[PDB]
Amino acid sequence: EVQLVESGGGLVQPGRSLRLSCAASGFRFDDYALHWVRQAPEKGLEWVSGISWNSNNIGYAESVKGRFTISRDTAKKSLYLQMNDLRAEDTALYYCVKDRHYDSSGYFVNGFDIWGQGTLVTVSAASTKGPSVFPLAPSSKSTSGGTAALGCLVKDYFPEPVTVSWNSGALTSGVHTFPAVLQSSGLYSLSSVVTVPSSSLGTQTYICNVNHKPSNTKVDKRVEPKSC
Amino acid sequence: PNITNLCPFDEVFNATRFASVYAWNRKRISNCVADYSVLYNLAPFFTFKCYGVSPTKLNDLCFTNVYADSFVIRGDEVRQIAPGQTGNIADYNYKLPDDFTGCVIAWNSNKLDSKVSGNYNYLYRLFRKSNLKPFERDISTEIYQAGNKPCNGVAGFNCYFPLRSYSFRPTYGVGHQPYRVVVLSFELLHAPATVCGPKKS
Amino acid sequence: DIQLTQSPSFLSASVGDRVTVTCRASQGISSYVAWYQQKAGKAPTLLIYTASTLQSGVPSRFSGSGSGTEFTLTISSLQPEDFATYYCQQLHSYPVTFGQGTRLDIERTVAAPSVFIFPPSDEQLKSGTASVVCLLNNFYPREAKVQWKVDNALQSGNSQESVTEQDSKDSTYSLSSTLTLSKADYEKHKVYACEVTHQGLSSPVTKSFNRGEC
Ligand SMILES: *[C@@H]1O[C@H](CO)[C@@H](O[C@@H]2O[C@H](CO)[C@@H](O)[C@H](O)[C@H]2NC(C)=O)[C@H](O)[C@H]1NC(C)=O
């Protein structure tokens, strides 16, 4: 089996360099061309760089040229993409791929056959913090047909996406957690809501458990209907 | 006799990259059983012109050893690979001997070695002081200076770089399209009878 | 350089039908084109190269055709695992260029989304921020439109939205709208309203509340 493994990714800040490592196995390394591709979240795909079999034909994208360095070593079966002068635009998932006919492009037979799982690289001007939780108290306008909607609002947790559980995992049906979004200020936030019949409102207590590993902050916040 | 493992006739005829003509590669096939049926069964090729034996009866005979070479040349000049022919590759790159007993295989590779911008991985030598004795390879890159004044590794009139680079493009005619060539050279001294094809009892 | 366009951005289909994706280029690139399939959160794999030659281990239902500046990918029969994303790739020059991407969706029954609007919590107000959330639930067509209307005045440039993945049980979608206001701006207005337009909704339905009403 042919396998490619990516390593070295993570979080950095603008103005600093970084290095990666694409280890390869299962095929002869010296008779195949390799490429580095990047993908932004929910933004399709985009090409970054490519190399030839003997390191003679190298091509870069305009918006990327003059900043990064591709280098292949056959001694350790390794491919390196040295990074320089990072910005927030480069935050993406990186794939290391292997072309099929020992040369970059233009030939009749070409194609990206084997794609690595890739690594996440994020560049930012902000630092890890604790999230703030404001519960979404259900009201008479949040219920319809005997079923009410309620949830929790967690905001301003920067480093990593957060996980939420309802009733310590007891309440799972009818739960929808929207994907995390990037606020204009540079901090992440999302909302998780659940629909429950109004017959249980006032008799059952619902507490959303929000667990954030990077800040080591475990917050459980109750949600109860508003009393006017 | 005994021995059944097939010879590696797929490593050479299925290789992705073929070495340039000026610096060719030499391969030894020994201690195995040959299977020439696949060669003319699968690959659509031209010019199976063999010297010293009829192509039909390669299965019955037994051989001493098999030497396999491989390179790529221009389309119009594939006829130059034969004893008694004169040409740039014949004189300076690959020269066949007067007494030859073997076959040559040439097939088109316009769908493999053609580049839209232009291939530059294939090179040939253009000029040399003298001819080459058969079965000799050259890796020399030093400047040959025809001028009286010694250029000594510089570029100028009466001095030229010995090597020249091919450039294959899909828009070329059939004459200039690249051709992959593999030559098989035999010897029929038949003392050991080690590497011959299938036979019963 | 050479720009490539996917004709259908999203295309709904059902099992056993015929679908076609048209990747159109700007210049004449002969037959240096390829197609790729990306699963849900997985590394994309090759499907076809030179638009005519199947690579390996690919079901015979897939096929491709085209010439010049037009290419088409054909699926003879649909299968449950065929739901994925499809990209087209140029291979003529050296700055390679991928298409904007085609996403396939399941085919099902129109759903009228349930509209819920929540008032800002008091705990948030003392922190200096105000937010009103417009909630859309269980609508089959992915496309929709959320309009923010405050004091009978349209609002723009200060709202964000997010859509969940298609449900594995109800095969519907959920949409949430987040509107950001300062504490001073929140108290200045009187009524906050949300406008929702949807295929399964005959007329725009507005869920709203008054600032001075509980
Ligand atoms: C070269 O590689 C091919 C892989 O495609 C080997 O297998 C042959 O593949 C063709 C393609 O249809 C078949 O028609 C042949 O029957 C296959 N050969 C077999 C099964 O022995 C091929 O053997 C390799 N070697 C060559 C061509 O000399």
Residue numbers in the entry:
A (entry chain B): 1 to 228
B (entry chain D): 330 to 530
C (entry chain C): 1 to 214
Sentences from the paper on this structure:
To provide additional therapies against Omicron, we isolated a mAb named P2G3 from a previously infected vaccinated donor and showed that it has picomolar-range neutralizing activity against Omicron BA.1, BA.1.1, BA.2 and all other variants tested. Despite the exceptional neutralization profile of P2G3 against currently circulating variants, development of resistance is inevitable when a virus is under selective pressure. We report here that P5C3, a previously described potent and broadly active neutralizing mAb that acts by blocking the spike-ACE2 interaction, not only targets a highly conserved region of the RBD but can also bind Omicron spike concomitantly with P2G3.
To characterize the P2G3 paratope and epitope interface in detail, we performed local refinement of the P2G3 Fab-RBD interacting region and reached a resolution of 3.84 Å with well-defined density, allowing clear interpretation of sidechain positions. The P2G3 paratope is composed of four complementarity-determining region (CDR) loops binding at the back of the RBD. The 18-residue-long CDRH3 sits at the top of a loop that comprises residues 344–347, and also contacts the amino acids at the limits of the 5-stranded β-sheet (residues 440–451), overall accounting for >60% of the buried surface area (431 Å2). CDRH2 extends the epitope by interacting with R346 that is engaged by residue W53 via a potential cation-pi interaction, an interaction that is probably conserved with the R346K spike substitution. The only potential contact from the light chain derives from the CDRL1 Y32 forming a hydrophobic interaction with V445 of the RBD. Moreover, P2G3 is only observed to contact RBD amino acid residues and the distance to the nearest atom of the glycan branch is ~10 Å from P2G3. The interactions between P2G3 and the Omicron RBD are conserved in both RBD-up and RBD-down states. Importantly, the epitope defined by our structural studies rationalizes the potent neutralizing activity of P2G3 against the Omicron variant relative to other Class 3 mAbs. Omicron mutations S371L, N440K, G446S and the minor R346K sub-variant are all situated outside of, adjacent to or have little effect on recognition of the P2G3-binding epitope, whereas two or more of these mutations directly impinge on epitopes recognized by REGN10987, AZD1061 and S309/Sotrovimab.
